[PDB]
Amino acid sequence: VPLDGGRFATSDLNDLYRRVINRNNRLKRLLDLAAPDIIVRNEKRMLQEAVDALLDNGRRGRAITGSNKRPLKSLADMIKGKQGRFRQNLLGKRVDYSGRSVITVGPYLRLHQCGLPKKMALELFKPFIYGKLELRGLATTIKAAKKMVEREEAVVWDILDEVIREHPVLLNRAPTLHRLGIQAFEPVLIEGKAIQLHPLVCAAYNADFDGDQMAVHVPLTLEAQLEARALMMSTNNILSPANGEPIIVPS
Amino acid sequence: IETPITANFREGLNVLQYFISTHGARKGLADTALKTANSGYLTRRLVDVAQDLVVTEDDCGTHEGIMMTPVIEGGDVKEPLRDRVLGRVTAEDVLKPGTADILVPRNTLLHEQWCDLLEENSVDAVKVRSVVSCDTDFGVCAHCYGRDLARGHIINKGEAIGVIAAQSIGEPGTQLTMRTFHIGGAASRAAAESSIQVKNKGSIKLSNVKSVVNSSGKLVITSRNTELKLIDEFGRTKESYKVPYGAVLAKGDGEQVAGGETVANWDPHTMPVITEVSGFVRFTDMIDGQTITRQTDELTGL
Amino acid sequence: GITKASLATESFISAASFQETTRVLTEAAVAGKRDELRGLKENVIVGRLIPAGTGYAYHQDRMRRR
Amino acid sequence: VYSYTEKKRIRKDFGKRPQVLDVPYLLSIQLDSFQKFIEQDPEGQYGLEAAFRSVFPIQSYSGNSELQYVSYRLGEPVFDVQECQIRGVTYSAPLRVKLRLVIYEREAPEGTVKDIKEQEVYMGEIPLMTDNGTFVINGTERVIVSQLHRSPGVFFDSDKGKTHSSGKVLYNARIIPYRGSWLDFEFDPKDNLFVRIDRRRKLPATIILRALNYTTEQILDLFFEKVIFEIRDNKLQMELVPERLRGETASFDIEANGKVYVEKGRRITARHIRQLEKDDVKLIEVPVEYIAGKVVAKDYIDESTGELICAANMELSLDLLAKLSQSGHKRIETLFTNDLDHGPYISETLRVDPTNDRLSALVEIYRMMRPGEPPTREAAESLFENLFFSEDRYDLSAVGRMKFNRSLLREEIEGSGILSKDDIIDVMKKLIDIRNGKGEVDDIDHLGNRRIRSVGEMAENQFRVGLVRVERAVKERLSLGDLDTLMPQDMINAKPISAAVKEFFGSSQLSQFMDQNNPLSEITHKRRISALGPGGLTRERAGFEVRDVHPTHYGRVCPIETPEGPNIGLINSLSVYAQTNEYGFLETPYRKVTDGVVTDEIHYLSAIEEGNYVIAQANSNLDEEGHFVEDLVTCRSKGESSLFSRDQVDYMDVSTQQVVSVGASLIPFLEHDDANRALMGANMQRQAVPTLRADKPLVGTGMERAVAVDSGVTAVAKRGGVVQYVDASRIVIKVNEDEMYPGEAGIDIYNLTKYTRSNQNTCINQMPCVSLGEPVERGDVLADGPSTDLGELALGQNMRVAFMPWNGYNFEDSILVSERVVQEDRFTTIHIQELACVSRDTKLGPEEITADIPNVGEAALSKLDESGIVYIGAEVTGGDILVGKVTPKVKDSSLRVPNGVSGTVIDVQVFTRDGVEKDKRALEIEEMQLKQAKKDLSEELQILEAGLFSRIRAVLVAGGVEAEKLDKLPRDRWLELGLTDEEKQNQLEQLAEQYDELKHEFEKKLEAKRRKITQGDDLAPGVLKIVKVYLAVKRRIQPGDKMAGRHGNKGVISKINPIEDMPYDENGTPVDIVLNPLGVPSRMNIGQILETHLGMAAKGIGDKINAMLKQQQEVAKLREFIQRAYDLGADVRQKVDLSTFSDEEVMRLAENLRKGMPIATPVFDGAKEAEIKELLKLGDLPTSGQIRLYDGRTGEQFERPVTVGYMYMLKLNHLVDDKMHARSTGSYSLVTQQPLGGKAQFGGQRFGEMEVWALEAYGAAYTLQEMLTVKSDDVNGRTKMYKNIVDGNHQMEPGMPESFNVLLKEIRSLGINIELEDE
RNA sequence: GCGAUGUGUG
DNA sequence: TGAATCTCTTCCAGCACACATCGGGACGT
DNA sequence: ACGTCCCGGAAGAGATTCA
Ligand SMILES: Nc1ccn([C@@H]2O[C@H](COP(=O)(O)OP(=O)(O)OP(=O)(O)O)[C@@H](O)[C@H]2O)c(=O)n1
Ligand SMILES: [Mg+2]
Ligand SMILES: [Zn+2]
């Protein structure tokens, strides 16, 4: 990685490899001069300890450190831990087409729909918008479309209504616990910058409006929209899966 | 703490009372954080052992079934038979207590109508099918899982019950944790009640009693798990209590008692070592300083 | 216990994802433990359908073909 | 009587308890500590002096050359604070040290050849402390939080239960030295005493005993008491002390000196011991079958030959008895070993000893310290001598020695800094004696064992580390002697010291970034007491008793202010009155109490000393003589607290506040809130953003004055005088005469700080509050800072609130705000962002800043000037270009407004690396700054000269007032004006010399400033020029922002409402915010309701004054009404009168009340329901405090009157336009092709592990597939998906997750082989 | 556009 | 002579944000 | 400077108690 400048901040794998290669080279040099036995023995031990560090630092005694005093990260640590590839990039992945904001109430909603600010909508459904623009023919290439949606000329709002009308979006609240932590809603464009949420659903999200934040995702493919409508809609969940008693109880 | 606050927010609080309240609230916060960590780790473990489990067949075709009875703690029946066996496939047909009048066939789904029938006909034991004894390979058949929740009808073929189960178990551990504070620092403590105050006319039934008749003509209990029960005037079991060791029974077994008739009486802060024989006492293997210690009352001189 | 019944599993990508990886990988290595997909977390790691719902219908199709 | 500024708004003040100690200066910790660090203190005693006198003189190997110390000095800083913030340097001062170098003579006694003083060798830099108590490091302003760590000394801990799973407690004694190696003693479940050192492996404590050069006989004689048997004809008369006749059954019929006195079997009772004592006999007679259970004391050899009979510490038997009997050793010594008095612990440990003598002992020590290497005799000897006895590598502080000698129950509290044989032995004796039953453990939470460092002590330790490295260097270069061909500028090396002190102030868990968005935030972040960091404990090893609160905190550390979250209780905040001891402990005030009279003489007490005394409590009614009013009064003695006698107390608390902190004592009605809500109130009040028009709180707690005056944000006048000139930039005060020096006369000038940037981007600003021609007194405000109103801490603004449900728009907590608020711009806060743009010359060529940009438009360039930098004032929006920058290829790389933020550009800085040419706008700004500097210094000289000449004109009235010859000539020609032969011409000499010195200092400072502004800069290696730009965003309020009260009532403002819909009251005025009733009895903070009522009282009085002032009312009426309002209440302290207000000050007092009569309420000695009812009823408001309200929509009445009042509400810098964010397609990470994370980087969210579980729990599977294959990772997949979308065909084609492919590559790079079998 | 520490949110 | 039980060593300890600073010195041309 | 280096829980394996 290049930091700000012509300097490269330390990278732990390359460090470990560099160490092992230096030890290997020096010991290769000793084994062409009939070197003395104590020195070749000491150097074999150094190479062994270096490879042990490389494979799995720290399982031996005092782990090496590179910055000042923190053990640098070896391959077993690229895999293990709360931050190995398993629990960090193969189960929970960062996702495109997402977004987030603060929630607020708006009691004028039918319970199968949620407000969603204009700017988040126009930022999330950009590809769909491009499609509909160059389908109507208001812009030939893709770059004309990009200019138009960036300048926010007054056609994109009608375009955006038509690409929203019947298109569920998944709302989520941060510490998701039970399978009601993700639900679907149909969007309704709003002014302002806060996601509005029907009041009979804070019981499920455990969301008071004292500043909670909710994240929205967009289902892309057609099967996925049908799932967000037939399995994850807000209406389709009016009974908790733990106990039978309702979970849309007025609060 | 053994020094309770004796004032309420509408009244002031002097500084000391408020300081004690601080003890309490910092309990609240600390426990939220750390016990949150615990509960989260718990749900993780659960959903990683209960994962590879998916309803896969419409009917295994067996006959094992666990038993289901109402659960009582000593007051009102806590979780009655209707609440326990709502929505679960009956293993073996329930005979009306008019024996040989088979009331429900042996693969019905006890939905709400059947629960009302069971409640009317006053049944207190149903043998019902259960996942733990389902004979399907690699999964669980539909019926043996019983009624789905979150939907009325029976479970479908696919709905991954492993994960939903693991979450619904581990969830209210976390949700209550991160909330345990905003009751305040109050102390959810209840006394042992020191006596079993029966509530309604009925008869008595003891289970696992090994008693003995003390000098004063009473009956003390020298058995560990002794469980007392109040039966009603129709045969139904209405009450169950845990009578601790060494407690004093008023009435023996099989005697009609009525309401408000204290039957048991013990000391809630002492596990006595009551005998069963009568005679003199010698200390065996009791050497001072090594095992026992020998204190003396200045006041009584003893 | 649960935190043992999850490790002593037929698959090993599951175990590897759960709570330690050194032990599971070394053991699975020395035994050559071939792992099928057969479950949910394995199929998610590898990134395909999940034999849970809609995915369950798909896996009917797939196991039928093979 | 009052300070003339106070007579501008004299706050009504409830509160019954008369105070006696004013609030101390709230930054004593930081300021005194650094001032103590950096100051020429003689006689050593905690300074740079101390570090130097402890490390110097550095002597070679007696190489007839030695480096010694003289004195030190600090230059002036090169850059004053403001320039330093602008540029990025450390506000530092050089360190010039006088080091002498003596050169002795070879072939001679210790005589010198020639000594030399390379005067003021330079070394390092040390960052000075700004007056506020904050350090500047790199253009930012950083703060060092004091640390609360365990006191160097000895502690006898228990560690009960857990270990050994048998309930057998252990007892480990630790010696914790302030600098060096630990030392630990601990038992085993085998009652063996084992030592360890630096928590390494374990050793037998007797090994260190006789590594101190003892012998086993000596050891036993030190630890155990002897027992004497005397060989005689009849049964070896034993010496029997009655003390050894307790608890057991003697093994014989006890007679001696005649008749039987204590018969066998009769367990010896106390009366039996009394019999024995009255018997006057200790020479008694014993059986022989008893000694079999004893151990011999010292060695017994055979006196006929000279060989060992039995060695010391060996048990006995009849054969050995006879063998040592043949030689006739008539007296034999053994060890009295009761299992209840004196366990043979040293005995057993000696038996377990695997060692022999000093040699083998030191061998073992070495072998267990530095493992696996030859145990050379000299090596082990030097090692052990240099672990606990060398002045270099081991040292207890003087505090160490104090706490040590105190805990050992020694006598004096001074001594050497190293341990000693006797000290280790006393530690061991105390440990064993604890094991027996006398003595107690020392709990650690007890504030008699923690200790507060601060900047002084920590910076001194780091500087000492720097010095040990420089001594290595100096000694190394000096031992290679060279006669005189060098001097002490090359033998030294400033670089290690500089690097060390830089490292400390920059990179640490303590020296951190100051939350500088709110005067309260500054002043409660400086007074913080962290328990983390180096030397202290860590959150993962953090126990739990330490997170609990402890009874010694009462009045030393705030109970109800701790940061909730990952580290609770470790980050205590300090109390209000608390101080640092002389040694470092936290002491607190009290009031001395003689017999029954509470003297007003204060008296500071530490932690431990608080225990011995009985202390009364501050809310005890005492009657006008220092006498208590009861005869039994609540008090606290040692942890406990109950009702004691009248004539037994010894100290009464000072004031009812001293239990809380500054952060918590600004909450009214605290004693009505749950502690959790008090805590959340403290935090939210710390997070409140300043506003555009500051406004006092109607209902405060009087601590605003101290906080706002001592927070520094305001400009407290120093010498009381008369205001001569006010102006939104500066304020120029004439000084009263009797408050001035003979010379140096002049006048005072305060340069206010106009709109500039804080660390949280809020706009720090100042405004003159005093108008021209107005007295000011010493210690008084002139400039409102950010969120200060007439010198009161006004964070938020007070709004008319009414508790009621209202069409759900406040369902959970969602405050509902009427449009009246947003119209009157009473939350329109100001931010100021800082945008940078660097220019670098790299391979392929440099990067220009020309206005010409490839593929842009004249509209997109108009706001740029002829160089490429925007004007000052160009109201840019999101997307525009601020600085046109291109890269060689040529590619657009300009700087642009971050998307979403509007606002005005207010300032542009340009830095050019020395050597590169300056462009035309850089020259423009150069000359602008030059002319500003010239005009400012010229104003200095001109106004100051005006003052001086005015004073001279005042002088020459007596002594030759010559009006003509005085105004004839230019006033500067006053060398020889007609004045008698007196001292007044000498005084004119004084003033004229001051004038000439002003001349020359103006000249020299102007020249230096021109040099500063002319010169180039020093910048990052690899940069050419930097262009900094500031914006001024004006963020309104809008549905989404977070407002909060002061009691945990948070809430996201949900719907803005038109003025009509607000529930207007019975008179017309529409309530301005609707809260939610259901929030109170759940969130048990009943405090805010009383705050509301009392505010409504205050504003009722305010409107009554407003009417009496609009209808002009013959100020007698105002006087009557104001007087009644100030005299209302029960027995209170205020007692103001309005017959001493000159009948015009009263008009101004009403002018400043017409917004509403403010009210105080000190924290716990506050108002009561009765007093609020009485005040409301003084107003024309209903007693209940509830009014009928009418609905704005339907116009028909509400049922059941509702609560209205004025609650003081706050904004919070958690704004919706800084939280909202959205990503459709942006960058991608580099190693695992996934989208980045965060908002700055245009990242998407984290569909996390539990969300994957939620989707698995549903039946959804296609959603999850596209959620972690296409939307995220697989590259072929998502390009094909993007195209399928832009064609209208919604369909996915999965492929495989790239990060999974990476997992394969790693598992494969290990030895393992993971593959993918064929289908 | 990497990782550390830190403060602060739900 | 072998099976308990005491000692030491590895492995884990909730989720999602937001923002800030800061990234290695030591010697021949 | 440029260039080129230096804490509960549990399971293994002592080791100590039965003979
Ligand atoms: N370590 C934490 C802290 C907080 N939360 C989230 O914060 C919520 C609690 O919010 P909080 O405001 O702290 O308490 P509430 O009772 O919900 O609201 P209030 O504090 O105003 O009473 C929890 O449900 C949880 O979702 C969390 O998940 N993990
Ligand atoms: Mg909350
Ligand atoms: Zn089955």
Coordinates of C-alpha atoms in Angstrom, one line a residue, chain B residues 13-147:
Chain B
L13 CA -32.8 12.5 48.0
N14 CA -30.0 13.4 50.4
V15 CA -26.5 12.8 49.2
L16 CA -26.0 9.4 50.7
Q17 CA -29.2 7.9 49.3
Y18 CA -28.2 9.2 45.9
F19 CA -24.7 7.6 46.3
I20 CA -26.3 4.2 46.9
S21 CA -28.5 4.8 43.9
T22 CA -25.2 5.2 42.0
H23 CA -24.1 1.8 43.1
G24 CA -27.2 0.5 41.5
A25 CA -27.2 2.3 38.2
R26 CA -23.6 1.4 37.5
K27 CA -24.5 -2.2 38.1
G28 CA -27.1 -1.7 35.4
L29 CA -24.6 -0.3 32.8
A30 CA -21.8 -2.7 33.5
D31 CA -24.0 -5.7 33.2
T32 CA -25.5 -4.5 30.0
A33 CA -22.1 -4.3 28.3
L34 CA -20.5 -7.5 29.5
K35 CA -23.5 -9.8 29.6
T36 CA -24.2 -8.6 26.1
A37 CA -20.9 -10.0 25.1
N38 CA -21.9 -13.3 26.7
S39 CA -25.3 -13.6 25.1
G40 CA -24.0 -12.8 21.7
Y41 CA -21.4 -15.5 21.9
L42 CA -24.2 -17.9 23.0
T43 CA -26.5 -17.3 20.0
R44 CA -23.5 -17.7 17.7
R45 CA -22.8 -21.2 19.1
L46 CA -26.4 -22.1 18.9
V47 CA -26.9 -21.2 15.3
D48 CA -23.7 -23.0 14.4
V49 CA -24.8 -26.4 15.8
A50 CA -28.5 -26.0 14.8
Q51 CA -27.8 -25.0 11.2
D52 CA -27.7 -28.1 9.0
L53 CA -31.3 -29.0 9.8
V54 CA -34.1 -28.5 7.3
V55 CA -37.6 -29.9 7.1
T56 CA -37.5 -32.4 4.3
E57 CA -40.3 -35.0 4.3
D58 CA -44.0 -34.7 4.7
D59 CA -44.3 -37.6 7.2
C60 CA -41.7 -39.8 8.7
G61 CA -44.2 -42.5 9.7
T62 CA -43.5 -43.4 13.3
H63 CA -45.2 -43.5 16.7
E64 CA -42.8 -42.2 19.4
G65 CA -44.0 -39.1 21.1
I66 CA -43.0 -37.2 24.3
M67 CA -45.6 -36.6 27.0
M68 CA -47.2 -33.2 27.6
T69 CA -48.8 -32.0 30.9
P70 CA -49.6 -28.6 32.3
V71 CA -46.9 -27.0 34.3
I72 CA -47.6 -25.6 37.7
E73 CA -45.3 -23.7 40.1
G74 CA -47.5 -23.4 43.2
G75 CA -49.8 -20.6 42.4
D76 CA -51.8 -20.4 39.2
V77 CA -51.0 -23.0 36.6
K78 CA -48.3 -21.2 34.7
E79 CA -48.3 -22.7 31.2
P80 CA -51.5 -24.8 30.8
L81 CA -52.0 -27.7 28.5
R82 CA -53.6 -25.6 25.9
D83 CA -50.6 -23.3 25.6
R84 CA -48.2 -26.2 25.6
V85 CA -49.9 -28.5 23.0
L86 CA -51.4 -25.8 20.8
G87 CA -50.4 -26.8 17.3
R88 CA -48.6 -30.1 17.5
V89 CA -49.3 -33.5 15.8
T90 CA -50.8 -35.9 18.3
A91 CA -48.7 -39.1 18.5
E92 CA -51.2 -41.5 19.9
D93 CA -55.0 -40.9 19.9
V94 CA -56.3 -39.2 23.1
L95 CA -59.0 -41.3 24.7
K96 CA -61.9 -39.3 26.1
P97 CA -61.8 -40.1 29.9
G98 CA -64.8 -42.3 29.1
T99 CA -62.2 -44.9 28.2
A100 CA -62.4 -46.4 24.7
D101 CA -64.0 -43.2 23.3
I102 CA -61.1 -42.1 21.0
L103 CA -61.5 -38.4 21.0
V104 CA -58.8 -37.3 18.5
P105 CA -57.2 -39.5 15.9
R106 CA -53.5 -40.2 16.0
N107 CA -52.3 -37.8 13.4
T108 CA -54.4 -34.7 13.9
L109 CA -53.0 -31.2 14.2
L110 CA -54.3 -29.7 17.5
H111 CA -55.4 -26.3 16.3
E112 CA -57.6 -24.0 18.4
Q113 CA -60.8 -26.0 18.0
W114 CA -59.2 -29.1 19.2
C115 CA -57.5 -27.2 22.0
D116 CA -61.0 -26.1 23.2
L117 CA -62.2 -29.7 23.0
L118 CA -59.3 -30.9 25.1
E119 CA -59.9 -28.1 27.6
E120 CA -63.6 -28.9 27.9
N121 CA -63.1 -32.6 28.4
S122 CA -60.3 -31.8 31.0
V123 CA -57.4 -33.9 29.8
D124 CA -54.1 -33.6 31.6
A125 CA -51.8 -35.8 29.6
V126 CA -51.3 -35.9 25.8
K127 CA -48.6 -37.9 24.0
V128 CA -47.5 -35.8 21.1
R129 CA -44.9 -36.2 18.4
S130 CA -41.6 -34.4 18.7
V131 CA -38.6 -33.6 16.7
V132 CA -36.2 -35.3 19.1
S133 CA -37.6 -38.7 18.1
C134 CA -38.2 -38.2 14.4
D135 CA -37.0 -41.1 12.2
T136 CA -36.1 -39.2 9.1
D137 CA -32.6 -39.2 7.6
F138 CA -31.0 -35.8 7.3
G139 CA -33.6 -33.5 8.6
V140 CA -37.0 -33.7 10.3
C141 CA -40.3 -34.7 8.7
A142 CA -43.1 -32.2 8.6
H143 CA -45.6 -33.6 11.1
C144 CA -43.0 -34.4 13.7
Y145 CA -42.2 -30.7 13.8
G146 CA -45.8 -29.9 14.3
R147 CA -47.5 -26.6 13.6

